[PDB]
Each structure stands twice: as C-alpha cells, then as structure tokens.
C-alpha cells in the first residue's frame, strides 16, 4: 500500500532524510517518534508529496508517484493529511470547510455533500458548530473539524503530522480519541506524535527516528519496554 | 511684504478648482494603473520565461527610477516624434505606470502573505492549483490587497503634485497663478499644503476604518 | 528627428557632473535628515506632553504632504521675505526635512519591533528603563533600523531628481541642458533613467548584502 | 513574604482575574494549574507587577507594591522570573547574560560577577557554553541559562511562568531537574506548569484555577488523589 523506498531529502546544506524506507500495509496504525531534527515530519510528508525526495522513490498502491508521470491530485485523493496547525479555511464555515473539496474535486451533488458533512460533524461531535467559522472554534474543535474535512474525501490512508502538539493539554484527549476511533475502524494511519499513549493504545507499529534515519522499530511494547538500541533508550529515558 | 492670509480668501475658487483637479488626476491615474498592475502581476506568474523576465524588468525599472524622469520622458521626450500629448494625458500616463508597478508588487506580496499552510491543506484535499487559487487563497489575498491598494492611492495624491512642473493646473499649480497677481508665494503654499494634509488625513481615516471592516 | 544615442557620447561629462551632483545633494540630505530625525524621535518619547504633540504634528504634517510643495515653500515661498536661498540649500533643506520625519518614524518602529519579552526580562532582573534601553533594547533596535535608513537613502536618490525643477544642476536637469544644444529630449532622459536605475540596483545590492550579515 | 490580595484584572472587556488571593511564605513550592484561560499566568505576573491589578493589592515582604509609592526595580531585585519563551538577551553571550544585571544593578565587581556566573553555569551544567551566544543553545540549554541568569541576582522567591511549554519533549526533564534542585535547596517557588510530575515530586501546595478564580487548593496528594471539587476532577481527568 505505501512504500517509501530509500529516500533522501535535502533543504540546501541541511540533510533531513538520509536514506529512509517505510512500508505500511492496509489497516496498520504506524507511529513515528523521535527528537526534533529526526526527520519524522519530512518522511511523513514524502508520502503525499508535500515534499520532493532528493533521491529514492515512493510508491502508493504499487505505482511510483515521484516520476512526474502521474497525476498528483489523483494521488492525494487517496491519501489524507491532518496538520499540526490545523490549516482550516478561515473564510469558510465548518460545513463549507468539509464540502469544498468533494463538490469541487469529486464533483459531488451539493445536497449529498451536505448530508456527508453533517454525518461527519456528528461523528467528531461538532454538529452544533456546523455553520460557525473557525475563529469561533477551540483548538480541539478545530482539529476535530480538520479531521472531518479530511475524511469527507474518503481516503484509504490518513497522514497525521503532530496533530496534538499545538493543543492545550486539556484538549489533547478529544482529538486523540477521535484518532483512536478511526484506528479501531481499521483506517490505515501514519502518525507522527509526542503522545506515546496513542501508540500504546492503538498503534500497530512504532518507528524511532534519529538524525534523519530509522534507527529502530517494532511493536509498541517491544520499543517501550525492550528497546534494543542505545539511542532509542536515550530518547525514551528523556521522554517516558 | 509680510504674511497676509486674509488676502488669499478671494482665491478660494482657485484652490477648490485646483483641489478638484488633483482628485480627477489621481483617481483616473490609479484606476488605469491598478488594472495595468493586475495585468503585470499575471505576467509574472506565467510559466513562460520570456514574459516573466519582461514583467520583472518592467517592475524593476519603474520602481528603481524617479517619477519625474518618467513624466518628462513621456511629455518632453515624445515631442521630437511629432507628439504633443497634453499635460493631462502625460500625467495620468506617468502615474498609471508608476502605480502599475507598485500595484503589481502589492498583489504578489498580498498573495505570498497568505499562510502556505492554506495551499497545503487545499492541495492535500485533492484540489489543483487552479481550484486552490479560486476557492481558497485569492479570497484571502484580496483582504491583504485592498488595504494596500487603498494606501497606494493616498501616495498617488501626494505624488501627483509633480504635474505642476509640466504646467498642469493642479492644486499646486495654483500657487504660481495666485502669486502672478499677488506676488505672494508663502501664504498660498501654506494654504495648499494644508489642503493636501487635510485630504491625506481624511483618506487615511476612511482607509483604516474600511480595513477594520475587513481585518 | 529620429533616435540617435551615439551623438549623446560627447555629453558624458554633463551626466557624470549631474550624477556627482545628485550624490552630493542626497548624501548631505540624508546625513542632516538622519540627525534631525533622531532628534524628532527623542521628542516623541518625552513625557512632556507639548513636546510629543509638536513632534507628532510635525511628523504627521510632513509625511502627509508633498515633497514638491515643501521645496517650493522653501524656495519661492520665502522670496517675499527678501530671501534668496540658492537652489541647493533649498533642496537639501527640503530633503533633510522630509527624510527627517520618515527617519523619526523608522527609529520608533525599530524600537517597537524588538520583542517586548526583552524589556520584560530586563525589568524583571531589576534594571531600570534607562539601563534596559541602553544595554538591552537599543543595541537591537539599531539592527532593526540601519536596514531601513540605508533603504531610505535609496528612496531619496529618486526623490532628489525633483530639485531639477528648481534649477539645480543635478542628473535630471542635464536633459534640459543637453537638449538646448541638441533638440533631443527622449535619448538624454532614457540615459538619465538608466543611470538612476543602475544607482538603485547597486545601492540595493550593497544594502541587502549589509543586511544579511546582521 | 508574598501576598496577592483579592485582585481582579481586565484586558478591555476580557475579565481574566475575578477576585484572587494568594499567600506564599518562605520555603514553599506553590504550583498553579488549570486550563488555558484560567488566569494562572496573569496571577503569577501580578506578583512582580508585570501586570497591574485592576483592583486589589499585592504586598511583598509586607510592603504594598502597587500603590505607585515604591521603587519597582528594588522589588524585582527580590522576585526573580523565568519566562515561557526564555527571553534571553541575543546580543550577549551566556556569561554576559548572567553578569549584566549584577554589574549594572547591584554594581558588583566584574571579577566577582564573573565568578558568580561560572558557579551558576556549572550549577545548571552550561560551563562549556560560557562564551556561546544564545542562538547556539538548544531550548533546554536556553532555559537553563535563563535560570542561571535569574539566580545570579539572588532572589528570595523565583517565579516560573510555564518554563517548559515551548520545549521539545526530549528537553523537559533537564529543565525540570534544575527546578527540583532549587526546590530541594529550599528556594521559594511559584510555578505555573503543565508538568504534573514536578508538582507531585516537589510541590508543597497545589492551586487549581478556572475561569479566573481559585476553585480548589491543597497538597499535591489531596488535589491529585482526593479532589473535592467537580471541576478539579474534570480537568484532571482530561490531563492525567
């Protein structure tokens, strides 16, 4: 399903990814962790080409998407993304946020799109906020809204780039809970996070990255209790 | 002699006429320059290398060069080609050009000022640059732009007083006229400067007030 | 007739003299205008309300009013008081004044741009406003300000072409001069614009180069 | 020693403190917690008059300091403050950061100031960084320097305004440790934090604030394990 194959990434003199390979199959919840400058979010964003690899290739559903001989919009229709800082459309209401892309990309019928949106709003517990504009939403309400919006395009995998880091601590749970609910429903997910609780609860696999490389991986309990590599132990000892 | 503003009163219709003339110049000048600027912007966004180079050269050259020299380049420089463009069409042309460069840049910057995250969200939801542009980015750039366009006008008011030297009967030109019959330069200039000041204040007030209607 | 730039070559000394004349005008205008501007700023910070009112009114009036009208107000408007200040001092006074207001605003803004956290840290460590300003805030406001002063100079170069209308022998005036002997307006103006342009590019290059270092 | 007495604070129509009283005596470590918008930081910043109460008074060492009849610089000499975003002086090196105030406020001798600084740098583990500029420091290193810098003025009470929130997770421990050490050496502390571990380990007293009011307070174990108030249990349930 997802196959990032030995990619490298540079931002000028900054080498962020130095040879990374990631395979995720349908239904997996994979969680990527590590210190700042590990390359977590860069690897995460290579999957739907928000970044372009300097070398290496990424295949989704068996087809390479970084050869310029494929329609990227068609790719990202399959691959959802939830952003650390929400990136809600400010001039658009909750419903409108959700329905913009289906109506304009998938050419869905407006009444149908509307029904989809109110279903998703109920799902993430935002029905009573349907019409409002973000500015009137709290951090949690915002991220739950962003998630609803992503889901309305019905992807087969969701990418999560530190979706909780910009939330007040009293607000982390609600967003994590929605994410877990999706995990329990078999959604394929790649999650970059600081919240180890999530990985404990619903993660299938944990990836520890350091200095632009995957240094160790395994199941959550393997990594959290029986980490083999010294760097992993260091990071965890500071983090847990 | 000595200061005597009271003597200036009877010339009120001259000032009022000068004032109305500064207004008419600036409005039409901006109006063309904005549309021009919009167009210049579009060229700089084109994938086509020569066109981008041209719009860049236009903007770069006009911004990096004095308003006066452009004015005189239109007025004086064209005479030797059997061209006798009026003071008016010369001033408007010059201003619309200067303003076109600054307006084009206002647009580019108003766009780049919208958080790149918006584009990221939009593309990631399957939208193409075109769609992202129509339904997401531009409606926000606009709220960045209208305030800076509105400000450009206020600058164009002050700048337009430069058409006096070309012999256009603007608000500043009046001070020549009046003095020809009064031998006084000071008092009518103090009056004229006061009018530019009051105009600037007025328009700044409405502009920011409008800005709050947006941001 | 029709275009002939080659004929313009022999007039090179006129341009160079014009060029050198614009520089000398502009350099001096800024140097005075900076000193003046710094002074006006200090006034706007003073607790003595009249002084702040005067400086505020000053700045607001000059910024909200054309450079030309200030020039002519000095040159022409002063004649009737039996005053015949040269084209040069008229121009320099006008520019140094205009630039003084804008410099005052640049300084105030360069100060307001240093993170208020710097002041809070300074006060909370027991330093009085004076010390915070001296040892903490100002050394930073400076790096905020120099890029804007340097750029202001670049604006004043373009501005200074306006003292031609007063009869100063600057770079723009030359086109009148040359045409009196050639009947050509176009070509000497294009050359003049090209010269103003090269000056703007050069100074912008050097200015930004100075800027990245800070 | 510290007595905030029934203060209120407004920022325009925004009522942030709605009648708050706080007493802290020598040697206490008081920790204030609550959801965003509780007013915690506002209360903390009333102590050294970084905020001015709309009503009410604040006394330190028994003298009223918000009557305009007191030298505020002499007060802030007694009451140190560590900031969420460090607020280091960028143009000054580490050691220069530390020695600026003693030299300019206390009029200390420069050799003496130099020795204080190297003592403190050693204390917080920044010895090898004495002549490095704030920009070469990682966030944890930054906050440790800010702490050394505060200490050189030898306050009788230290205020901590969320000293850990802008740190990458791998960096929280080292800063918290320094704080704990200060706690263990008997330093009077008022700490606003999200890190309940610290409150558990070294807090003497825990204050829970909500909607601009102190709604419940008590010892760490009382608040974390036997909380009487409903809101306290609710907040904790989202947080723990």
From TrEMBL, chains A, D:
Domain ABC transporter: 2-236
Signal peptide (UniProt feature, chain positions): none
Pfam families: ABC_tran
Coiled-coil residue spans: none
GO molecular function ontology, one term from the record: ATP binding
CDD domains for this protein: ABC_HisP_GlnQ
Binding site residues for Mg(2+): 41, 162
Binding residues annotated for ATP, in chain numbering: 11, 36-42, 51, 194
Recorded superkingdom: Bacteria
Keywords attached to this entry: ATP-binding, Metal-binding, Nucleotide-binding, Transport
SUPFAM superfamilies: P-loop containing nucleoside triphosphate hydrolases
Presence of the UniProt keyword Transport in the record: yes
UniProt similarity note: Belongs to the ABC transporter superfamily.
Protein name listed in UniProt: ABC-type polar amino acid transport system, ATPase component
Provenance organism: Caldanaerobacter subterraneus subsp. tengcongensis (strain DSM 15242 / JCM 11007 / NBRC 100824 / MB4) (Thermoanaerobacter tengcongensis)
Phylogenetic lineage: Bacteria, Bacillati, Bacillota, Clostridia, Thermoanaerobacterales
Gene: GlnQ
UniProtKB/TrEMBL annotation, chain B:
PROSITE patterns: ABC_TM1 (PS50928)
A GO molecular-function annotation: transmembrane transporter activity
Subcellular location, record wording: Cell membrane
Ubl conjugation is among the record's keywords: no
An example Gene Ontology biological process: amino acid transport
Alphabetically ordered keywords of this record: Amino-acid transport, Cell membrane, Membrane, Transmembrane, Transmembrane helix, Transport
UniProt family annotation: Belongs to the binding-protein-dependent transport system permease family. HisMQ subfamily.
Its membrane topology: Multi-pass membrane protein
Domain (ABC transmembrane type-1): residue spans on this chain: 19-207
Membrane-spanning parts: 14-41, 189-210
Keyword field contains Transport: yes
Any Pfam family matching the protein: BPD_transp_1
InterPro entries: AA_ABC_transptr_permease_3TM, ArtM/GltK/GlnP/TcyL/YhdX-like, MetI-like, MetI-like_sf
Name of this chain's protein: ABC-type amino acid transport system, permease component
GO cellular component, one term: ATP-binding cassette (ABC) transporter complex
Superkingdom to which the source organism belongs: Bacteria
Biological source species: Caldanaerobacter subterraneus subsp. tengcongensis (strain DSM 15242 / JCM 11007 / NBRC 100824 / MB4)
């Amino acid at each position: 399903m997802i196959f990032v194959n030995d990619v490298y990434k540079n931002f000028g003199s900054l080498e962020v990814l130095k040879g990374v390979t990631l395979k995720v199959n349908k239904g997996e919840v994979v969680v990527i962790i590590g210190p700042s400058g590990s390359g977590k979010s860069t690897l995460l964003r290579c999957i739907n080409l928000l970044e372009e690899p300097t070398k290496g290739e990424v295949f989704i559903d068996g087809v390479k998407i970084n050869n310029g001989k494929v329609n990227i919009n068609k790719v990202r229709q399959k691959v959802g993304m939830v952003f650390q800082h929400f990136n809600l459309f400010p001039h658009l209401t909750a419903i409108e946020n959700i329905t913009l892309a289906p109506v304009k990309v998938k050419k869905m019928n407006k009444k149908e799109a509307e029904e989809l949106a109110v279903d998703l709003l109920a799902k993430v517990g935002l029905l009573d906020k349907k019409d409002q504009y973000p500015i009137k939403l709290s951090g949690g309400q915002k991220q739950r809204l962003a998630i609803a919006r992503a889901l309305a395009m019905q992807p087969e995998v969701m990418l999560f780039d530190e979706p909780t880091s910009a939330l007040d601590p009293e607000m982390v749970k609600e967003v994590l809970n929605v994410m877990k609910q999706l995990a329990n429903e078999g959604m394929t997910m790649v999650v970059v996070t600081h919240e180890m609780g999530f990985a404990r609860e619903v993660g299938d696999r944990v990836i520890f990255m350091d200095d632009g490389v995957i240094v160790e991986e395994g199941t959550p309990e393997e990594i959290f209790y029986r980490a083999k590599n010294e760097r992993t132990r260091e990071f965890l000892s500071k983090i847990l | 002699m000595t200061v005597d503003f009271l003597s200036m009163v009877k010339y009120t219709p001259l000032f009022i006429s000068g004032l109305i003339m500064t207004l008419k110049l600036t409005f039409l000048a901006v109006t063309i320059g904005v549309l021009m600027g919009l167009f210049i912007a579009l060229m700089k966004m084109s994938s086509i290398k020569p066109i981008k180079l041209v719009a860049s050269s236009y903007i770069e050259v006009i911004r990096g060069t004095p308003l006066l020299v452009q004015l005189l380049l239109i007025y004086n420089g064209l005479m030797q080609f059997g061209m006798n463009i009026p003071a008016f069409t010369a001033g408007v042309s010059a201003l619309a050009i200067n303003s076109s460069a600054y307006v084009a840049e206002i647009i580019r910057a108003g766009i780049q000022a919208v958080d790149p995250g918006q584009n990221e969200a939009a593309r990631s939801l399957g939208m193409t640059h075109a769609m992202a542009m129509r339904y997401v980015i531009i409606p926000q750039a606009i709220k960045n732009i209208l305030p800076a366009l509105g400000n450009e006008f206020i600058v164009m008011l002050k700048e337009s007083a430069i058409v006096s030297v070309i012999g256009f009967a603007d608000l500043t030109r009046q001070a020549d006229i009046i003095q020809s019959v009064t031998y006084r330069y000071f008092e009518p200039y103090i009056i004229i400067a006061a009018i530019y000041f009051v105009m600037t204040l007025t328009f700044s007030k409405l502009l920011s007030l409008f800005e709050r209607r947006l941001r």
